[PDB]
Copies of this chain bind each other. A is one copy, B any other.
């Protein structure tokens, strides 16, 4: 239902806790850590977003950083948010 986007190293523990707290609140909430399998990164990352109605971004000390000048949409948080 809810996708969590974050910069891995700083959404981190909070991003995880968000999953846990929303699962406590009954939402089937999943995270970047969980939904990567047997193939390319995009091709497992992004599909979760389309099926989700709701998209949380954990905004943190390197959340938006690697999006800067990312015109080629190389950053995964960029691909997720796009």
Q: Is A24 an interface residue (CB 8 A)?
A: yes
Q: Indicate how many identical chains form the complex.
A: 4
Are B24's CB and A17's CB within 8 A? no
User: How many residues does chain A have at the interface if contact means C-beta atoms less than 8 Å apart?
Assistant: 9
Name the 5 nearest CB pairs between A and B, nearest first.
A13-B13, A13-B14, A17-B17, A20-B20, A13-B17
Tell me the A residues contacting B by CB distance below 8 Å. 12-14, 16-17, 20-21, 23-24
Q: Could you jot down 15 A-B contacts, CB within 8 Å?
A: A12-B13, A13-B13, A13-B14, A13-B16, A13-B17, A14-B17, A16-B17, A17-B17, A17-B20, A20-B20, A20-B21, A20-B23, A20-B24, A23-B24, A24-B24
